[PDB]
Amino acid sequence: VHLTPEEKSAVTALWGKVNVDEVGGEALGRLLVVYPWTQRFFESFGDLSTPDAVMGNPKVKAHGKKVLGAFSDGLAHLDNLKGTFATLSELHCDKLHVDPENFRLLGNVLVCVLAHHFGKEFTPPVQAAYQKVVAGVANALAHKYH
Amino acid sequence: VHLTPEEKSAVTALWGKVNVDEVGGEALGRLLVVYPWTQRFFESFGDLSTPDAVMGNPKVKAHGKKVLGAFSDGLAHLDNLKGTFATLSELHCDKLHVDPENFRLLGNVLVCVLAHHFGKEFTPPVQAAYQKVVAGVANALAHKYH
Amino acid sequence: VLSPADKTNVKAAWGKVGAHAGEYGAEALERMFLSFPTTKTYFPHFDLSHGSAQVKGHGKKVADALTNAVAHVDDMPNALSALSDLHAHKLRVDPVNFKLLSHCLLVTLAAHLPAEFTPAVHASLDKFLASVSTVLTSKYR
Amino acid sequence: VLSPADKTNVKAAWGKVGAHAGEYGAEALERMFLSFPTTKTYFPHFDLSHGSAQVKGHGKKVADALTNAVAHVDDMPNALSALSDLHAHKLRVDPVNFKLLSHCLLVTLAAHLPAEFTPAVHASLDKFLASVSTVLTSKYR
Ligand code: HEM
Ligand code: HEM
Ligand code: HEM
Ligand code: HEM
Ligand SMILES: C[C@H](Oc1cc2cc(C(N)=O)ccc2nc1N)c1cc(F)ccc1-n1cccn1
Ligand SMILES: C[C@H](Oc1cc2cc(C(N)=O)ccc2nc1N)c1cc(F)ccc1-n1cccn1
Numbered sequence: 001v002h003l004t005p006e007e008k009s010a011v012t013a014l015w016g017k018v019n020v021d022e023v024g025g026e027a028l029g030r031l032l033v034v035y036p037w038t039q040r041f042f043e044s045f046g047d048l049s050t051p052d053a054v055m056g057n058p059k060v061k062a063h064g065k066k067v068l069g070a071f072s073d074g075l076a077h078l079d080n081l082k083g084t085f086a087t088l089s090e091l092h093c094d095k096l097h098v099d100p101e102n103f104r105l106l107g108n109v110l111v112c113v114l115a116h117h118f119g120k121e122f123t124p125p126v127q128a129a130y131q132k133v134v135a136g137v138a139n140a141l142a143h144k145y146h
Numbered sequence: 147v148h149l150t151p152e153e154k155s156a157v158t159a160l161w162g163k164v165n166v167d168e169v170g171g172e173a174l175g176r177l178l179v180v181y182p183w184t185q186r187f188f189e190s191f192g193d194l195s196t197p198d199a200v201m202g203n204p205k206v207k208a209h210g211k212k213v214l215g216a217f218s219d220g221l222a223h224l225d226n227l228k229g230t231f232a233t234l235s236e237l238h239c240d241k242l243h244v245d246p247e248n249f250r251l252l253g254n255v256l257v258c259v260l261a262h263h264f265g266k267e268f269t270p271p272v273q274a275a276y277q278k279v280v281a282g283v284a285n286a287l288a289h290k291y292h
Numbered sequence: 293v294l295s296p297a298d299k300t301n302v303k304a305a306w307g308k309v310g311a312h313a314g315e316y317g318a319e320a321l322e323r324m325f326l327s328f329p330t331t332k333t334y335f336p337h338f339d340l341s342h343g344s345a346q347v348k349g350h351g352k353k354v355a356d357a358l359t360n361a362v363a364h365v366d367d368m369p370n371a372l373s374a375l376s377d378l379h380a381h382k383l384r385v386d387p388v389n390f391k392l393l394s395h396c397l398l399v400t401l402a403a404h405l406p407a408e409f410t411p412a413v414h415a416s417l418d419k420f421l422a423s424v425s426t427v428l429t430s431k432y433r
Numbered sequence: 434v435l436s437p438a439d440k441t442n443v444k445a446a447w448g449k450v451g452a453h454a455g456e457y458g459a460e461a462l463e464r465m466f467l468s469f470p471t472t473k474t475y476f477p478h479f480d481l482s483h484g485s486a487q488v489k490g491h492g493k494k495v496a497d498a499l500t501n502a503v504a505h506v507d508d509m510p511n512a513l514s515a516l517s518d519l520h521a522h523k524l525r526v527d528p529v530n531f532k533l534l535s536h537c538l539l540v541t542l543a544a545h546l547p548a549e550f551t552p553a554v555h556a557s558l559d560k561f562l563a564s565v566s567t568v569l570t571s572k573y574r
Pocket of ligand 2: 184187188190212213216217234237238242244248249250252253283284287
């Protein structure tokens, strides 16, 4: 993923302000509510029967924090996403059988959450830079499918 | 793309019987009729206003033969698809701006055409082997978009 | 969104299946499980070996549901409401799997009804199966 | 397939846009052209620089078409027939571009109407924009 020095600076500055306890869980929760078939992968989380049940579920919040950590890892390795994520891609493809279209959906839900938290500060150029990042992350998670 | 010796043998035997003058043009023609937005990329071919106009168009038939040649090139390099399609990936991405989902659509239309020509001889195991081939070709064509 | 010509094409093409319904449905499932093995994860309780009576019975149910969808082509959300509750709410089938089965049904039709599988009919059947797929994957009750 | 709750959620959130229709529509287009530059290839005749009067005017047309779609949510093929003529028959817009603009509209709504953009409302808006997208990319005349 190539980001301009201006984009790198804007992405890093906004990322440093992200509420690490909330943003991941909100992105995961929204994925589960907006694309309901994704709930099939998280049966062990228990009650996901309503939007409020999903958003307030502690397993969604804890797992969402791990997912956010992985996007953070992506941002730190933009020149080597396939390498960094090799074992993560193996898990999602060989063990979990997650169709790769869902990785694109999660990346875009995360962008919606960032817009929701940052308001007008999530400017169109800041979004454009984040789109390159989430596309890179999605492609890296799908790379072990062949 | 990994194919078993049995799959390699079945793929090669059917491919050797393909009508090279018709199959590619029929796959391209069907792409244009079934997914009509794809016509936007072929405005230079003239009349594509009806299914009969598409299927009988000489530019569709000649271009379809070139597309079939490229799938054939893929079969000749199954261990190095990304390398084989590097320049074609750049052409479809940088110059033509073809969204990669369309590559998967063309691969599947080609599978429909092979079923149409071979009938019951295009068995479920023969199809399964061809699905691995066309998925490999589609992924290799999309690889320079990243 | 289906055109009036799409509806005529679908009624005529699917009408040629008739008593072959179960056979085409079973073959489409067989093609799907072999070509896209991840689809097998929705059927852990099935015997999926060749000539399985369970796949044969299921193929008939799928094909009969499509016949019912054709009989109510302008009222599919209402007509398919129970199947939608099954696939969307209960089974939580990923929409990709519907693209895979729809493709396998088209391959089956192309192999066994070549005279019917013209480009126009192929386009109309693809749109019909995509419309049925959206209804089965949507939560709208 | 939209649920009755989906329709009311869409009416309520989109209703809060009101006079800010053109501004949200223009921002969604701006976000789209910057984030997904290939979308610019459909607008070679446009001035696409920041604060472009042409993008602002176009943003108002897109937002007003969505307001109209909300007002005819149960009769979108008939209400949006001229827009399907344009996008499906004339411009031949690849359906991927509709996913991109729909996403940019959701981002715009999340950034500027946070109190409205709840998970339930987000799900309803996504389904509504996907339904509008299928109508505009289908040939059904
Ligand atoms: C594209 C962005 C994604 C990222 C960065 C991501 C990241 C992660 C990470 C870091 C883990 C923990 C790995 C471990 O400790 O063993 C994980 C687990 C998992 N992910 Fe993802 N994931 C993504 C998308 C998805 C999607 C779209 C789904 C399903 C629709 C999914 C389903 C799962 C499941 C089911 C697990 C195992 C959870 C458990 O322990 O029960 N992931 N993911
Ligand atoms: C996935 C399988 C595909 C293969 C193997 C393939 C192969 C080719 C080949 C070999 C060429 C000729 C290149 C040259 O002359 O240097 C070509 C050109 C082209 N392809 Fe593809 N293609 C594929 C999919 C697509 C799709 C899906 C579209 C559009 C929807 C597309 C649109 C074009 C166009 C517009 C050209 C240039 C034709 C011209 O000369 O005016 N291709 N393709
Ligand atoms: C054209 C698309 C489809 C149609 C018309 C369809 C139709 C049906 C019908 C009629 C049943 C029987 C319901 C009953 O017993 O009353 C059924 C069951 C089921 N379907 Fe589908 N289906 C479709 C696609 C799919 C796909 C793509 C999958 C997953 C890959 C799937 C998985 C299932 C499962 C797991 C069951 C339950 C089987 C059992 O336990 O007996 N279906 N489907
Ligand atoms: C929610 C989705 C969309 C809606 C509601 C929409 C609505 C409209 C409307 C109302 C017009 C003006 C028609 C007129 O002048 O009478 C228009 C024009 C147009 N739209 Fe869309 N549109 C959508 C998506 C798209 C997308 C995704 C693209 C391509 C990326 C696109 C490309 C165009 C173009 C090129 C024109 C002609 C602009 C001009 O020459 O003035 N539209 N659209
Ligand atoms: C009766 C039907 O009503 C709707 C169909 C819709 C489809 C979609 C869609 N996404 O395909 C989205 C919204 C719809 N709204 C309708 N009123 C209809 C009406 C029409 F004018 C033309 C064709 C059809 N049609 C019959 C089968 C398929 N399409
Ligand atoms: C009026 C509409 O009619 C159809 C909608 C269709 C959609 C698809 C689809 N692919 O989404 C396929 C076939 C359809 N056929 C209809 N008659 C409808 C009817 C219903 F019972 C529930 C919701 C809606 N609805 C309103 C907006 C969107 N959906």
